[model samples]
Target: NQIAKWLEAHAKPLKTTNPTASLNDLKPLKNMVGSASIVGLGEATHGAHEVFTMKHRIVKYLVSEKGFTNLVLEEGWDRALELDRYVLTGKGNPSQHLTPVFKTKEMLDLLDWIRQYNANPKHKSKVRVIGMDIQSVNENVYNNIIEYIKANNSKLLPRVEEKIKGLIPVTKDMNTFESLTKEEKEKYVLDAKTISALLEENKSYLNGKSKEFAWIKQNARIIEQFTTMLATPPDKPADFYLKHDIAMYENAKWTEEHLGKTIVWGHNGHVSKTNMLSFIYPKVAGQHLAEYYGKRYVSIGTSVYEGQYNVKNSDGEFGPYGTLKSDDPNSYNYIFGQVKKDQFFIDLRKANGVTKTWLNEQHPIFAGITTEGPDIPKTVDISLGKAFDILVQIQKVSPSQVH
Candidate 1:
């Protein structure tokens, strides 16, 4: 009863899930996100209508009120660049550019809204999307790198082409990259390193002073990171996981430096101050961001008490919406549900007395849903106080309709 009482007393009840609805309800967030250059808006599950819509609303709030303009997603750099083109210029099919997980009606509408917002002459800073993840490198990335090299130092173009040739197929899919023989993996590593170094060394000649060359150089860095990660021995999972998060951190930091203040969008696990799945991953991107930015890095984690959400099933298919209704009295989702609010926001940093004491203690909380099959515990033990600066609680959710 104390938990419920505390929640009801502290939580700011939200008005609606409508992304474009009156942002007056989110005014408290302006102070809550104070002085933070990068805000991580985390999702409870990958595909929940309420969760995505709330994130959209937050983005609108941050952009309209706080001057934040860039959106960093947990997608590959190339994929997000394509989306950015649409957001900035209205030049492409937005849905075709997004991955299956992101090809949802909610996401598409958000993208459209951002595009229209950018079109308005009233707003000076247009919203931009950047992908911090490096799982895949498309054909365009390779082409961009080679073209840049040829334009600058044509003599080295042949060498650059050959070096990237062995890596083209490997970078397309993780499984294909992982299936490489030890010797084959080593060759790609060498290729990635050589190209990246060559570009960096001749950056001045390559017009590296400009964004064009800088992004091309970063594309090479993406290749290097991908190869380095895949080349790590299966036994060195800690190093592998750390490398992945570090790659994301590097990309996110680059966005902050090159663009403007950013809103990072991803699952709660990837954006938490601590690794939610410590048993598996090392430090996550959020932990690195927190360490780098201190109080300037604020993460708002979302939670759902009961919901129908989409997730990959046992057969590797995302279907038949996964349903969950937590009965565990010890879990944070259940405790938050006891507050009886359909949706609300809580600033974990402001907790005091019994609320602070209880939150500081370890308690089971819903971890982001990755799969819907059997044998997975729905909750992980984590102190909400330690994991995030703020929390967004939802009582129930429906699946995000994906195209």
Candidate 2:
């Protein structure tokens, strides 16, 4: 196993937390994190044993030791409210979040730990959970509009629901928005506008900043984005993705400012700060956050030498899990695997000149660029130049536990 002996020689080793380390062994990695407002913990794949647990380790250290108080994730905002309550108050079953996309038991375990920590009335610190994606807001807001009309505008209610439903048979089918007939489109847009007006008309009844109001407003905004999308379909492969990033960043920033320091748990691409691939949207969510926060935002990218991770197969059945045979001996991940500490974080920022040169070269990892489209997955080449300050390497891994 002639792995990254060079990395071992020059890189700053991270002593990771285990059963009893209390996460104190992560000093070298923490030094790189500094006083970050949002500590972005990224994973190479959508699901993996090490990636999930390693993040838990980092989160434990930050919340228990550093007092980092918020965990904003990649799930939809409104749905995350349910998970948030479960974690911060132990009000619901940890597994209930799987109904609308969050299917991981790893996420459940994190919530359980957070809930247990907060149960101590003695500790003043409590970690809040927030979601930053545009998941079903279109549907969420639509439901709100239905309720709003029930209370405020019975006259417009019937036609509103009918017209909107004509454009949207279901909440998840956003493509329906772009396919609306000219008349159907006009009616839906007009109906959404009318609903927006009605909400403002009774502003005194519902405070502008109330949670209920925010839901309705956001859903309405989704309608707005949808309408805009339909007009010209909005230059895809880039433009709309940028909008998604901007919105996701703004949500994270808001959560950070309101809740204190945040630990943003997301895929490698969303949390990565660099645009080494010449992506059209160079200011992706992570890049935008880094630009906005300067040194106050720190990122940690995760990868593995080789192992298996869960994925839904073409049969639409849960996987026996997909497999990664081994490392490309020349890849950076392979180098880190050679370091052989089970699983560890290495501060690339602390590398020596010789290691630095090699680290800067194109490295391979099976990382996520966008968590969209279909199910098939593959690796992409990235360099250390603009990645995170450190990369967490797991020598071996297993499929993650999911709902």
Candidate 3:
């Protein structure tokens, strides 16, 4: 009862899930998110409409009110560069890069809003979109590197072309790369290292250390990361996750240094300050950010009482997956639903006594979506207070219009 009463008093109600909603309700967040230069907004499920729209609303508020200028996502850097171009100058088609995970009206709406926001002449510095994940590469990355090389040192263009010849087709296809023999995989890694070394060795000679050169160097680095991921042994899943998370952290850090104050958008598990799945991941990306930034890195986690969310089934089809309710009485989702407000955010950092004790104790959290199907548990046990600074609980949700 004490916890419930405290929650009733403190859980600030949100105006609506509408991405373009008024900013008045979000003004309270300034105090909750004080001094955080890099804020992480995590979703309960990748396909929940309320979660996405709510995050979109938060992005708008942070950009308009809190001086945040970069919206970083858990997407491939290559594809993200395309979206960033569209956001910056309205030149490219965003649909070309919106993968299946992002093929939704909600995502489109957010992109449109970002473009419109950047177009406003009143704004001094336009908001930029960035991708932190390094899962795949595309033709855009290849062309960027090739064009830069062509202009800077045409002599090396043929060598760069030769190195990328074997990799270009399978840059985005991991499964196909996995089927290759060990010798073939090694060749790809060797070629990637050569390209990376070429960029590093020619740092000064390549356009006098400009932003364009920086991007080209990073593009080479991402190619190396993707190829390395592909070449990793299938027996080492834990090692793979660890490297992936660290790379994400490094990418985020690089963005913060180069760009401006950024907002990280991704799954709850990936953004938690502590390892939600200690058995699989050595450390989540947010944990690394927290270690580096301390109070400056704030992580906001999402939870749902009951909802329909999209996920790929055992048969490999994407569709709506529904939960009647969080039946486990011990689950944080269930406990959070007990609070009177249907949609509100609580600052776990401010919890006292009963609330703090309960939050510190391990409890199951809904983590229903993943690449691997049924093997991964739908819920993971974690201490809510330790893992997240802020918690947004929605009583119910509906799946997004995923394509």
**Local accuracy of candidate 3 as per-residue lDDT tens digits, 118-181:** 9989997998888878777788888888998889998888888898877787776666666777
**Model 3 regions more than 4 Å off:** 371-375
lDDT of each: 0.85, 0.68, 0.83
Tens-digit lDDT track for model 2 on 305-336? 77877765555545435776544766666666
Clashing pairs in 3: none
**Candidate 2 all-Cα RMSD:** 4.6
Best-to-worst ranking by TM-score: 1, 3, 2
Cα RMSD for candidates in order: 1.6, 4.6, 1.9
Which candidate has the top score in TM-score?
1
The candidate with the higher TM-score, 1 or 2, is 1
Best by lDDT: 1
Clashes of each: 0, 0, 0
Stretches of candidate 2 off by over 4 Å are 1-3, 9-21, 99-102, 138-237, 276-283, 314-316, 368-377
State, as a TM-score between 0 and 1, how close model 1 is to the true structure.
Answer: 0.95
Q: Which candidate, 1 or 3, has the higher TM-score?
A: 1
